[PDB]
């Protein structure tokens, strides 16, 4: 299920025990986001993530 | 930990690990509507709310 909420610029969301996702700013329909996560946790834009999955399948 | 700064337009998504996704659902002024997909056992908290909970022990 998808958790849907609101975050204003400057506000943060905590995922799990070590990850944070912060809205750093908004420009039209563009959102500048800051993700802080432990070294072991990878963070990728979806377009990159998809290619990674496709290449891990070989 | 490390910091990653990126841009996501409404409708775009980012992945954290292999089980979590964050999607920008909309923008109204300075507020952003966000959709988060995570496994049942992964807590999702608004930082300012979690801090209050922590404070009240």
Q: Resolution in Å, one decimal, please.
A: 2.0
**Which chain A residues are closer than 8 Å to B16 by Cβ?**
15, 19, 21, 35, 37, 41-43
Range of the domain at B53: 1-57
Among B2, B6, B10, beta carbon nearest to A33:
B6
| Domains identified in chain B, total number | 1
Residue B52: its H or E element: helix B47-55
Q: Which of B44, B18, B49, B11 is nearest to A31 (CA)?
A: B11
**Based on the number of CB atoms within 10 Å of its own CB, is B42 exposed (0-12), middle (13-18) or buried (19 or more)?**
middle
- Other CB atoms within 10 Å distance of the CB of residue B20: 21
Solving technique for this entry? X-ray
Please count the residue pairs, one from chain A and one from chain B, whose beta carbons lie less than 8 angstroms apart.
Answer: 144
CA distance B31 to chain A (A): 4
């Amino acid at each position: 299920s998808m958790l849907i909420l609101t975050r204003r610029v400057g506000e943060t969301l905590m995922i799990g025990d070590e990850v944070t996702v912060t809205v750093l700013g908004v420009k039209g329909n563009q959102v500048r986001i800051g993700v802080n996560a432990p070294k072991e946790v990878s963070v990728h834009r979806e377009e990159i993530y998809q290619r990674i999955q496709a290449e891990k399948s070989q």
